[PDB]
Amino acid sequence: RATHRLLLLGAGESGKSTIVKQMRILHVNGFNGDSEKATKVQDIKNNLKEAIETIVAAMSNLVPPVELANPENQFRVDYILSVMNVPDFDFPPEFYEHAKALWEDEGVRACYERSNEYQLIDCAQYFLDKIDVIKQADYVPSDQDLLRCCVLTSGIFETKFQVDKVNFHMFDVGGQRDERRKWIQSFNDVTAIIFVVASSSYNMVIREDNQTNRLQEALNLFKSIWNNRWLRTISVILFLNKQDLLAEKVLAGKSKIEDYFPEFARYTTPEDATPEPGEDPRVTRAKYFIRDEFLRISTASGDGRHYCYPHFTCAVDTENIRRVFNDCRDIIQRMHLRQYELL
Ligand SMILES: Nc1nc2c(ncn2[C@@H]2O[C@H](COP(=O)(O)OP(=O)(O)O)[C@@H](O)[C@H]2O)c(=O)[nH]1
Ligand SMILES: [Cl-]
Ligand SMILES: [Mg+2]
Helix, strand or coil: CEEEEEEEECCCCCCHHHHHHHHHHHHCCCCCCHHHHHHHHHHHHHHHHHHHHHHHHHHCCCCCCCCCCCHHHHHHHHHHHHCCCCCCCCCCHHHHHHHHHHHCCHHHHHHHCCHHHCCCCCCHHHHHCCHHHHCCCCCCCCHHHHHHCCCCCCCEEEEEEEECCEEEEEEEECCCHHHHHHHHHHCCCCCEEEEEEEHHHCCCECCCCCCCEHHHHHHHHHHHHHCCHHHCCCCEEEEEECHHHHHHHHHHCCCCHHHCCHHHHHCCCCCCCCCCCCCCHHHHHHHHHHHHHHHHHHHHCCCCCCCEEEEECCCCCHHHHHHHHHHHHHHHHHHHHHHHHCC
């Protein structure tokens, strides 16, 4: 009975393309068949190789550098560096055995744990932990494997689908810095903006300059969107994404939010916080602090004729996104009448 046009906005690697993948799983045909699977098997292997070669290459460049725990692995390091830039790598059995032995080296792992000091795809641990699965000749990627796959294709990508007679036309708008000049061109008859944030990347810097904090970049972009003159009446659904990785990072206790956002040291969990069942209170405090950084922007200015709807999301978790998207569906249905509450 209606067609809604939703824009996914957000910095690079925030989760936009992953959300589209979930929409296709839920409302189209997912990753289609063996042809797509097979063609995308190469992306998974290339992620695995990118992960291990990035970690290995970073060891000598960290300050202080990190050495192998077992010097017997030196030839494996050399092999990985040697094939780092081979086009169309063929992934023979020895690649997996060498990658796995390096992944198990405590020095390589120690370098991995300092990955916020270089640029490492978030799916590194996921794929490195299942080398034995991926290396099998009869390996077929699961939907989760394909969701975790990191392929940062620039451009604007679109999906359209119907749910209970309502159409949703969703735009995955590339958000790396050199793509943002194009954002305004997708603002054609927008129902709502979905702004996606990598909540877990508070201790990381962006690829574009290897200097600007990733979460600060997201906050700056959200401020740009929230206060934009041509979005004053367009509400913003905020996906505070990567909640799984955020919880892991908070609980590991090695990278403190307050070293990057000092006001966290004085931050108390709000009284109206609604932690999930089983949630560690340290994670609640972290995720609500990050939420409240965005809500401070949305309450500070630009709040005239639109609302912000925050959600905690895990874009690789299909059931999580089913639930959040259904909440979005209801938010959208309720927007028309809610607009009359505004002054
Ligand atoms: N563990 C986890 N990984 C995520 C989440 N969202 C995205 N990822 C991964 O982050 C990486 C980049 O996501 P992507 O959608 O391609 O980024 P974008 O299109 O540039 O916004 C992919 O490897 C995704 O699998 C999340 O909530 N949890
Ligand atoms: Cl982000
Ligand atoms: Mg993308």
